[PDB]
Design a protein around this ligand. Structure first.
Ligand SMILES: CC(=O)N[C@@H]1[C@@H](O)[C@H](O[C@@H]2O[C@H](CO)[C@@H](O)[C@H](O)[C@H]2NC(C)=O)[C@@H](CO)O[C@H]1O
Length: 365
C-alpha cells in the first residue's frame, strides 16, 4: 500500500492557460490524498481566503462522492506565510486552544479529513512552538475521535529535507508519535538564492560528484535516510517530488552543474516568477534545448541559450518511485499537481504526465 499525496494551490486559478487550475481540474482517482494550500489564521481561528472558497466546498463534496476512499486535507503554512503567520496564535496555550477548536469545527463542517501543518521552517527559534502546536493538535484530534462516530482527523506536516534545518527545527521522535505521516519537502535543494551563485539541481536524488562534506546532505536520498535515522518510521515518510524546476541565467559559456550564474532564469510566461518554471512551461523550454541526464544525481537538466533549468521528468518520477519502494517509504507526495501539465496540452503526453507516471510506478508490481 503506497500513498500518493497531492498538494494543489489556491493561486493557480489566477494563471492563464495552460496553467489555469481550479479544483474542478482534479481527477478524483489520481491521488489517494489531496491537500489544499493554504488556509490562513485570523483572530487565532482558521479560515480560507480564496475568492473561490465556497466553490472549493462544492468540489470537495463532489470529489468524495465520486471516490469515497479519497482523503482531502487542509494545509496551513507555506513559504510566504513563514513563521510570522503563526503568530500571535502560537504565543500561548489559550490562543493555541482557540485555534485547535476552530480547526476541528472547520474541518468537520467542510468535509475535510485532516490538517497539514507546513511550517516553513521552524528553525531554532520556533522549534518549541512547532513541537507544542503539533502535540496539542494530535491530542485534540485523538480526544475528538474518542467521542466521534467519524474517522479521526488526520494530522500531517510538511517538513524540511535539509539536515541542518531538520536538526534545528524538529523533535523527531515526538513528531513520529504525533503525526500520521510527514510530507518530506525533498526539493529546493538548490536555486538562484545560493551564494556563491552557481547552477545546481532543485531535487537531485543522489549526491553530485563535486559534493563533499556538508554539501553531500543536499539530496533526496540523504534527506530520507536522515529522517529515518532520527526516528521517523520509514512508512511515515511520504517523499516529496516536485513538478517544477529551478532556473538560472548563466554568467559564462560554462553549462555544467556548478557553473556560474548571474541570477535566476527568465520568468516563465505563465508563472511569471524568475527562478522557477512549472512543468507545462518546461515542456516549452525544452524545445530547442539540450538535455543532460546526470548519472551521479539521477535527474535531468536542460540548457538553451544562457538558460539552465534543473527539473524532474517522467524518468525522474519512475526513478524516485523505485527508490522510495526500496526504502519502504509510505509513498510519494507531489508539489504541486497544478504545476504538472494537468491539461495535457503543453507536453503532449496526456493529462498529468508526471503524476500519472508516479501513480503507474507506485501501482506496478
Ligand atoms: C507544502 C509546503 O509548505 N510547500 C512550500 C511552498 O510554500 C513552496 O511553494 C511556493 O509557495 C509560495 C506560497 O507560500 C508560492 O507563492 C510559490 O509560487 C511556491 N513556489 C512553487 C515553485 O510552487 C514549495 C516550493 O518551493 O515548497 C515549500 O516551500
Amino acid at each position: 500500500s503506497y500513498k500518493l499525496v497531492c498538494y494543489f494551490t489556491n493561486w493557480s486559478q489566477d494563471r492563464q492557460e495552460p496553467g489555469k487550475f481550479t479544483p474542478e481540474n482534479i481527477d478524483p482517482f489520481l491521488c489517494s490524498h489531496l491537500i489544499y494550500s493554504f488556509a490562513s489564521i485570523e483572530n487565532n481561528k482558521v479560515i480560507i481566503k480564496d475568492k473561490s472558497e465556497v466553490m472549493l466546498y462544492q468540489t470537495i463534496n463532489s470529489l468524495k462522492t465520486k471516490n469515497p476512499k479519497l482523503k482531502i486535507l487542509l494545509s496551513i503554512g507555506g513559504y510566504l506565510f513563514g513563521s510570522k503567520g503563526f503568530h500571535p496564535m502560537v504565543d500561548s496555550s489559550t490562543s493555541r486552544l482557540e485555534f485547535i477548536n476552530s480547526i476541528i469545527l472547520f474541518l468537520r463542517n467542510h468535509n475535510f479529513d485532516g490538517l497539514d501543518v507546513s511550517w516553513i521552517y521552524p528553525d531554532q527559534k520556533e522549534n518549541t512552538h512547532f513541537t507544542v502546536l503539533i502535540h496539542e493538535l494530535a491530542e485534540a484530534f485523538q480526544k475528538d475521535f474518542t467521542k466521534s462516530t467519524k474517522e479521526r482527523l488526520l494530522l500531517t506536516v510538511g517538513v524540511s529535507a535539509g539536515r541542518q534545518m531538520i536538526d534545528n527545527s524538529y523533535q523527531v521522535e515526538k513528531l513520529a508519535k504525533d503525526l500520521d505521516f510527514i510530507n518530506l519537502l525533498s526539493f529546493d535543494f538548490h536555486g538562484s538564492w545560493e551564494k556563491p551563485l552557481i547552477t545546481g539541481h532543485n531535487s537531485p536524488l543522489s549526491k553530485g560528484w563535486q559534493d563533499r562534506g556538508p554539501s553531500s546532505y543536499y539530496n533526496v536520498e540523504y534527506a530520507v535516510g536522515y529522517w529515518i535515522h532520527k526516528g521517523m518510521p520509514s512508512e511515515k515518510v511520504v517523499m516529496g517530488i516536485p513538478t517544477y524546476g529551478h532556473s538560472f541565467t548563466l554568467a559564462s559559456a560554462e553549462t555544467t552543474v556548478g557553473a556560474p550564474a548571474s541570477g535566476p532564469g527568465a520568468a516563465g510566461p505563465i508563472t511569471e516568477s524568475s527562478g522557477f518554471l512549472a512543468y507545462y512551461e518546461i515542456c516549452q523550454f525544452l524545445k530547442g534545448a539540450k538535455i543532460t541526464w546526470l548519472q551521479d544525481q539521477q535527474v535531468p537538466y536542460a540548457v538553451k541559450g544562457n538558460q539552465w533549468v534543473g527539473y524532474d521528468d517522467v524518468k525522474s518520477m519512475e526513478t524516485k518511485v523505485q527508490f522510495l519502494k526500496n526504502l519502504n517509504l509510505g509513498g510519494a507526495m507531489i508539489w504541486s499537481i497544478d504545476m504538472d501539465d494537468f491539461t495535457g496540452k503543453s507536453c503532449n503526453q496526456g493529462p498529468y504526465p508526471l503524476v500519472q507516471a508516479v501513480k503507474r510506478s507506485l501501482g506496478s508490481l
